[PDB]
Ligand binder design. Structure first.
Ligand SMILES: [Zn+2]
Ligand SMILES: [Zn+2]
Ligand SMILES: [Zn+2]
Lengths: 102, 16
């Protein structure tokens, strides 16, 4: 939270995770059409790609694999059953597996 | 197992 906390490389990675976590959610739920926020449009591309992907979870796609990662950290820190995050709902509904769309 | 390596935060690394 703050004070005398230390961010090690590993934690800074997890921090960048939560950053691209928020990036994922933002893109997933961004209703603002004029929002040209850099991470938004980039995430929205990454997200909307998973939508039309088929190599996603069969151990093929990198993008959809990594997006699954972000959505999974987030999936535990999420409650919404109709969450905007694509891979969140696939993950936190399965809970056991990970593959999206089974 | 236990969180995949999230290359997405590398693919989309936010810099200003
Ligand atoms: Zn946006
Ligand atoms: Zn994909
Ligand atoms: Zn969620």
């Amino acid at each position: 939270s703050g004070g005398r906390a230390t961010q090690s490389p590993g934690d800074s990675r997890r921090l960048s995770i939560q950053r691209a976590i928020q990036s994922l959610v933002h893109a997933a739920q961004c209703r603002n059409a004029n929002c040209s926020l850099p991470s938004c449009q980039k995430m929205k591309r990454v997200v909307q790609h998973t939508k039309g992907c088929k190599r996603k979870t069969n151990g093929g796609c990198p993008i959809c694999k990594q997006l699954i990662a972000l959505a999974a950290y987030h999936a535990k820190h999420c409650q919404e059953n109709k969450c905007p995050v694509p891979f969140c709902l696939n993950i936190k509904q399965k809970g056991s597996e990970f593959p999206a769309g089974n | 197992g236990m969180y995949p390596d999230p290359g997405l935060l590398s693919y989309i690394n936010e810099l200003c």
